[PDB]
Design a protein around this nucleic acid. Structure first.
Length: 84
RNA sequence: AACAAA
């Protein structure tokens, strides 16, 4: 199946509508408080639109981070935090 | 849904 790096675990979810000031450490701070993220997978790389993946400690903690940050009213946009 | 750009 299609995947990012060697993070083949099912603990992964998707993230989008990243703010103009997103930072790699922000997933290790906020999302780590929500589920102790094991791995980051930013894909702001060229050749397509910026987006990212996130790999949780377990599928159970990912539900709390999704319910706490998904579909959030932002300036002119709305945060995306849900699984594929 | 800013969904593999490994």
């Amino acid at each position: 199946v299609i995947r990012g790096p060697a993070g083949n675990n099912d603990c992964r979810i998707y993230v989008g509508n990243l703010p103009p000031d997103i930072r790699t450490k922000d997933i290790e701070d906020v999302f780590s408080k929500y589920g102790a993220i094991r791995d980051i997978d930013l894909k702001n790389r060229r050749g397509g639109p910026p987006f990212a993946f996130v790999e949780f400690e377990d599928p159970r903690d990912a539900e709390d981070a999704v319910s706490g940050r998904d579909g959030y009213d932002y300036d002119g946009y709305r945060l995306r935090v849900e699984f594929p």
